[PDB]
Design an enzyme around this catalytic site. Structure first.
Site, PDB file in Angstrom:
ATOM      1  N   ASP B 289       1.192  -1.274  -0.268  1.00  0.00           N
ATOM      2  CA  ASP B 289       0.032   0.561  -0.084  1.00  0.00           C
ATOM      3  C   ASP B 289       1.318   1.300  -0.029  1.00  0.00           C
ATOM      4  OD1 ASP B 289      -1.349  -0.722   3.850  1.00  0.00           O
ATOM      5  OD2 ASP B 289       1.096  -0.110   2.461  1.00  0.00           O
ATOM      6  N   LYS B 388       1.586   5.862   8.106  1.00  0.00           N
ATOM      7  CA  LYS B 388       2.942   6.572   7.299  1.00  0.00           C
ATOM      8  C   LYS B 388       3.168   6.794   5.999  1.00  0.00           C
ATOM      9  CE  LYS B 388       4.307   2.695   7.976  1.00  0.00           C
ATOM     10  NZ  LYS B 388       3.932   1.103   7.692  1.00  0.00           N
TER      11      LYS B 388
HETATM   12  O1  LIG Z   1       2.105  -7.601  13.430  1.00  0.00           O
HETATM   13  P1  LIG Z   1       3.298  -6.346  13.332  1.00  0.00           P
HETATM   14  O2  LIG Z   1       2.907  -6.775  15.407  1.00  0.00           O
HETATM   15  O3  LIG Z   1       4.799  -7.671  13.386  1.00  0.00           O
HETATM   16  O4  LIG Z   1       3.745  -5.766  14.026  1.00  0.00           O
HETATM   17  C1  LIG Z   1       4.240  -4.877  12.636  1.00  0.00           C
HETATM   18  O5  LIG Z   1       3.590  -4.520  10.734  1.00  0.00           O
HETATM   19  C2  LIG Z   1       2.545  -3.562  11.044  1.00  0.00           C
HETATM   20  C3  LIG Z   1       1.859  -3.240   9.891  1.00  0.00           C
HETATM   21  O6  LIG Z   1       2.129  -2.540   9.170  1.00  0.00           O
HETATM   22  P2  LIG Z   1       1.844  -1.151   8.175  1.00  0.00           P
HETATM   23  O7  LIG Z   1       1.487  -0.720   8.711  1.00  0.00           O
HETATM   24  O8  LIG Z   1       2.839  -1.111   7.164  1.00  0.00           O
HETATM   25  O9  LIG Z   1       0.693  -2.600   7.340  1.00  0.00           O
HETATM   26  C4  LIG Z   1       3.308  -2.100  11.747  1.00  0.00           C
HETATM   27  O10 LIG Z   1       2.066  -1.304  12.198  1.00  0.00           O
HETATM   28  C5  LIG Z   1       4.331  -3.043  13.005  1.00  0.00           C
HETATM   29  O11 LIG Z   1       5.428  -1.210  12.899  1.00  0.00           O
HETATM   30  C6  LIG Z   1       4.871  -3.995  12.631  1.00  0.00           C
HETATM   31  O12 LIG Z   1       5.594  -3.654  13.456  1.00  0.00           O
END
Ligand SMILES: O=P([O-])(O)O[C@H]1O[C@H](COP(=O)(O)O)[C@@H](O)[C@H](O)[C@H]1O
Lengths: 561, 561
Positions: B289, B388
Site C-alpha cells: 500500500d 505512514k
Molecule cells: O504485526 P506486527 O506486530 O508484526 O507489526 C508490524 O507490522 C504492522 C503493519 O504494518 P503496516 O502499517 O505497513 O501495514 C506495523 O504497523 C508494525 O510497525 C510492525 O511492527
C-alpha cells in the site's frame, strides 16, 4: 515571485469580433507586446476588487503557439490580482468544455485560445476568444470595452518568473511579493467536467448497449486532429464501449496534421471514402475546437445540417435531458432550411427565426425561451451550455438511432414522408470584388421592394414560383432590445420555398456572396432525388433576378454545400 | 437499482487485527458471504441517521481480488444508505493517499483493500483495512465493535444490479428503490489530492534542481509492482523531472510480479545489487500500500530505519512544512533504536517511546504533541496525515540531500559523529516451541529483577556493560487511557547501550523470539567499523544471559533485518 510593471506601446487593430481576436501566428510572435497588451486588456475590464475572489477558465485546441499564450495569460492574471486560474490539462480544453466549466464553477469568464475551423501551425492562424460568466462569448458592449483599452494601454503588469507545469493535474500555489493571499492555478482533466455534463443529458446505458453490444451499431468518428479527439476517446471508446478503431485521427496535432478542421464533404473526404464501402452504419466529422459537426450515414448518405436539427426536434423527447427539463422553444438562423419549421408547427412549439450568429440563440436561452437551435453551417446545440457542441449533436443522433432501431437513411426518408423534403443548397462566391457584389445587392433590393414584386411569378420548368414576401431581414432581439438590420435578402415563395442572398464579406475589397436555396417538396416520389437536380429550376431563377454573373463575372460558385 | 436483503450465517474468525483484516485470498473467495459480512459489519458501525450525508473513501494497492471486493463495497454501501463514495481510478489508491483524501474532504472514514507488505495473487494474501474520520486506522474500540457484529450478524443489505465502472473519472449517480436521494460514486485521480499535499509540504523547485539540474542526482526508485508505481512516475518523474529510467517496477501487478512487496534487504535484493554497481547516489524501495520505505546510498549503503528518523529529525528544518509548522514532539516505537532519542534530547522537544503499531502515534498527533515519528519496520511519517508515508520519507531525504549537497554516506558519518552511533540489527527467531520460549523469557525476567542485577558489570572483547536499568516495558497512552503491559524485556546499560526481547507467538503454528540489538557507540574511530562485529559483544551477552541456544536450540538467527 515578483510583480513587474511593463511600460508598453498600444495597437490599433486589436478589435475582438464575436469570435475573439483571430490573427496570423506570425503577428502575435513578431509584434512585441501584441499578445501581452490584448491579454492585459481582457483582465482590465474586470473590476480590481472583483479580481481576488475571481476565477478564470483557460484552454485551447492545442494548435501551435497555444502553450506560450497560456503561460503569458498566467503571468499577467497573477500580477493583476486574479485569484484563481482553472486551466485544462496541457492547456487542452474544447470550446463546449470551456462553456461547461465556466457555468459549473461560477467563473467570471474564460479565455479560449482557438481559431475554430481556421488552420493552425507556424504559418496558420491563432486567436484569443473571451467568454463571460454565463459561459457564452463576450457581447459587443464588452468587446468594445476590451478594444478601447487595447488601443489606450500605456502599461501592463506581469510576473516574469512565474512558470506553471501545465501537464501535471492538481492545485499549484504561488506567493506574490508582499501579497497576503496566494495566487492559485488549478489544473483540471480536459474531459472529466464535460463528460459528467453529457452523462446526465444522455442515457450512457442505452448508448453502451448500442455501441458495444452483440448486434451493435458500427460507428466511425473523424476528430480531424483537433481538440475534440481526446473527448471522443475517453467518452465514446472508453466509457461507452465503442472499439478504438471507431475513433479515427483522435490525437490533437499543433498543425491539425496539415489539414483544415472543418466538418464538410471535401475537407473530411477521408470519412466519406470510409463510409462508401458500406462497413459502417454511422459516420461523423468535427472542427478545431469541437463546437460544429458533419453527420454521415451508411454508404456515404450525407445528412444535411438543416435536416439534422429537424430530425432531433422530431425525436427530441428520446433524449433524457429534454424529457425532464421540457422543450422551452425551437430556433434557427434565417438562412437555415425550413425543415425545423415543419416540426415546430406540427408539434405546436415556439419557432424563432434569428440572424446568423450564436449570440441571438444565447439571449433566448438565458431568457428560458430556447431549448434546441440549428445553423446551416454545421451547427446544432441546446441550452445545456452557451456555445455550439459538435459531440453533443453526435450523441443526440446516436440516442435517436438507439431509440428507433432504424438506419440513418430510413429515419430521414421517414421524416421527409411526414413533414415533406426541404431541398437545401448553399452557393459560396469566394474572392468576389466589393463594388460588383454591393451593387448587385442594392439593385436586387430596389427590385424586390417594388410595390408589384409581391405576386410576381417565376417559372424554370414544370412548377411555377409566386413571390408572397420580399424583404431585407431585420431582427429585434426581445432580451437586450437590439435591432439587427440588413441581415439578408429573402425572396419567400407561396409554396414555402425561399431564395436568400447574404453579403458575408462586407467591409473589404474581397467580398463573399452567400446564396441559399431552400426548395420545399411534399411530393413523395420527388423527395428521394438528387438535391442539385431538384433545386436547378429555383437556382436558375436566383441567378436571373440577381444578375449575379453580370455584376461578378462568376459563371459558377466557388463552393457548393 | 433494487435493494434486496440477504439472509446470512455468521463467522467466528472475522477478527480485525491492528492493521485491518489480513487473511489468505482463499478464505475471501471460497467461503460464501465472507467479504459481504465483514463489509456490512464495517458500514453497520455508522449510526443510521448519519449515513445519507456520509462519504466513504475506497481504494487498494491493486492486488488480486481488490476489484471484486470494491464492487461489493459499492453495492452494500449504496443499499445500506451511504450517500457518497469517493473511489480512486481503477480502484487504485495508496494508504497515505486514502488518509490524505479522508482528512481533506472530511470523510467519515475509509475502507482500504490492502494486505501491505504481504504478497498478493491467487495463492497470496488479502485484507480489508478500515480507517476512521481522522485519516488513521480504526482504534481497538472500533475494530472490536466490528468483530462483535461480524461474530453475530444474521443478514446484510445489497444492490445486486448496481455495477459502477472504476475506469472513468467523474461523478456517477444511481437511483435506488424507495429512496428520495440518489447514490453518488465519485471516481477521483489516484495521485492528484496526494500530489497537491506533498507540493505544499516540500519545496518542489529545489527538488527539480536536484534531480534534473547540471549535477543531476542519479536516483533509483523501486516500487516493487505495488500501488506506489503511478505515484513515482507522476510525481518523481513527470513533475520533478527524474529520467524514466529511475522508476523501476512502477506498474501495479495483481501478483506484485510473483514477489513480496516488502522493502527489506532480503526481498529488495535486486535494487541493492543494482546500487552496489556504484552508478547511482540514492536508491529507495516501497511496499504494497505504499506507507513504508527502504533508503540506500551509493554502493548499496544501507540506511537503518531507526537511524533514518534521526537524520530527518537532525536536519528537519530543511523541509518548508516543519519551518512553518514547528516541531511539537518526536516519537518512536520501543523496539526502534535510540538514535532518534539522542537527537530529541539535544533539543527542548519532547520524546515518546510507544508500542509498535502506528495507532499509538496518531493519538499524540491529534493532541498536537507529535510532528515526526518512525518505526524500525521501514516506517517513517509526520502529522501531515494519520498514516505512514514512504514517498514522503523519500522526498524528505531528497530535501536533506539538496540542502546539504553531501552524499547519503557522508550525512550519516557526520550524524554518527555528532550524536554517536546506535548500532541496530533485527534477529527474528522464527517458530520456536512454546514451553522453552516462555521459560527463557521468565528465567531472564527473574534474572533482571535480581536485587544485585542493576549495577552488575558484563564484559566481552572491548566494552564493559554495566546494567543501569532493567525492566519489562509497559505503556500508558495519554489519550485513550489504556495500559499495555509486558511488551518486551529491556536490558539497558548506563553508557547508552540496550538489548530488547519481544516474544511474539501464536496458539497455532509456534512462537517467535524477536531479538533487537541497540549498541550505542560514542568513540570517534570505532563507529565506522562493520555492525556485525561492533554489535558482537551485546549479541553474545543476550545469548549467554537469556541462555538462548540452550533453551531454543537456535545456533543461528532465522531472520536478519
Ligand atoms: O504485526 P506486527 O506486530 O508484526 O507489526 C508490524 O507490522 C504492522 C503493519 O504494518 P503496516 O502499517 O505497513 O501495514 C506495523 O504497523 C508494525 O510497525 C510492525 O511492527
Amino acid at each position: 515571485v515578483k510583480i513587474v510593471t511593463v511600460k508598453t506601446k498600444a495597437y490599433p487593430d486589436q478589435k475582438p469580433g464575436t469570435s475573439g481576436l483571430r490573427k496570423r501566428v506570425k503577428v502575435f510572435q513578431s509584434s512585441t507586446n501584441y499578445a501581452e497588451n490584448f491579454i492585459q486588456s481582457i483582465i482590465s475590464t474586470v473590476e480590481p476588487a472583483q479580481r481576488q475572489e475571481a476565477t478564470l477558465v483557460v484552454g485551447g485546441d492545442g494548435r501551435f503557439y497555444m502553450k506560450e499564450a497560456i503561460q503569458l495569460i498566467v503571468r499577467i492574471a497573477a500580477a493583476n490580482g486574479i485569484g484563481r486560474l482553472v486551466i485544462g490539462q496541457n492547456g487542452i480544453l474544447s470550446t463546449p468544455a470551456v462553456s461547461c466549466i465556466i457555468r459549473k464553477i461560477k467563473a467570471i469568464g474564460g479565455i479560449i485560445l482557438t481559431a475554430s475551423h481556421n488552420p493552425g501551425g507556424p504559418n496558420g492562424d491563432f486567436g484569443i476568444k473571451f467568454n463571460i460568466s454565463n459561459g457564452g462569448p463576450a457581447p459587443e458592449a464588452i468587446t468594445d470595452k476590451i478594444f478601447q483599452i487595447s488601443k489606450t494601454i500605456e502599461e501592463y503588469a506581469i510576473c516574469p518568473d512565474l512558470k506553471v507545469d501545465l501537464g501535471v493535474l492538481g492545485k499549484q500555489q504561488f506567493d506574490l511579493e508582499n501579497k497576503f493571499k496566494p495566487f492559485t492555478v488549478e489544473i483540471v482533466d480536459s474531459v472529466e467536467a464535460y463528460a459528467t455534463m453529457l452523462r446526465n443529458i444522455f442515457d450512457f446505458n442505452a448508448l453502451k448497449e448500442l455501441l458495444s453490444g452483440p448486434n451493435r451499431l458500427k460507428i466511425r468518428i473523424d476528430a480531424m486532429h483537433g481538440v475534440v479527439g481526446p473527448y471522443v476517446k475517453k467518452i465514446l471508446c472508453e466509457e461507452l464501449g465503442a472499439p478504438a478503431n471507431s475513433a479515427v485521427n483522435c490525437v490533437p496535432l499543433e498543425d491539425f496534421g496539415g489539414h483544415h478542421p472543418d466538418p464538410n464533404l471535401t475537407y473530411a473526404a477521408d470519412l466519406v471514402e470510409t463510409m462508401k464501402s458500406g462497413e459502417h452504419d454511422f459516420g461523423a466529422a468535427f472542427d478545431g475546437d469541437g463546437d460544429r459537426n458533419m453527420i454521415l450515414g451508411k454508404h456515404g448518405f450525407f445528412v444535411n445540417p438543416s435536416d439534422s436539427v429537424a430530425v432531433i426536434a422530431a425525436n427530441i423527447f428520446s433524449i433524457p435531458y429534454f424529457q425532464q427539463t421540457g422543450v422551452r422553444g425551437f430556433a434557427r438562423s434565417m438562412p437555415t432550411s425550413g425543415a425545423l419549421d415543419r416540426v415546430a408547427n406540427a408539434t405546436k412549439i415556439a419557432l424563432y427565426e434569428t440572424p446568423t450568429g450564436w449570440k441571438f440563440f444565447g439571449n433566448l436561452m438565458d431568457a428560458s425561451k430556447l431549448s434546441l437551435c440549428g445553423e446551416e453551417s454545421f451547427g446544432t446545440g441546446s441550452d445545456h451550455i452557451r456555445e455550439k457542441d459538435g459531440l453533443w449533436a453526435v450523441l443526440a443522433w446516436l440516442s435517436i438511432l438507439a431509440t428507433r432501431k432504424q438506419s440513418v437513411e430510413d429515419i430521414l426518408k421517414d421524416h421527409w414522408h411526414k413533414f415533406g423534403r426541404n431541398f437545401f443548397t448553399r452557393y459560396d462566391y469566394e474572392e468576389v470584388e466589393a463594388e460588383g457584389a454591393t451593387k448587385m445587392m442594392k439593385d436586387l433590393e430596389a427590385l424586390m421592394f417594388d410595390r408589384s414584386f409581391v405576386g410576381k411569378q417565376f417559372s424554370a420548368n414544370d412548377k411555377v414560383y409566386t413571390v408572397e414576401k420580399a424583404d431585407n431581414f431585420e431582427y429585434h432581439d426581445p432580451v437586450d432590445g437590439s435591432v439587427s438590420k440588413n441581415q439578408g435578402l429573402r425572396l419567400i415563395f407561396a409554396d414555402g420555398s425561399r431564395i436568400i442572398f447574404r453579403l458575408s464579406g462586407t467591409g473589404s475589397a474581397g467580398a463573399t456572396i452567400r446564396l441559399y436555396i431552400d426548395s420545399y417538396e411534399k411530393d413523395n416520389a420527388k423527395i428521394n432525388q438528387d438535391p442539385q437536380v431538384m433545386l436547378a429550376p429555383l437556382i436558375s431563377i436566383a441567378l436571373k433576378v440577381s444578375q449575379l454573373q453580370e455584376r461578378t463575372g462568376r459563371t459558377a460558385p466557388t463552393v457548393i454545400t
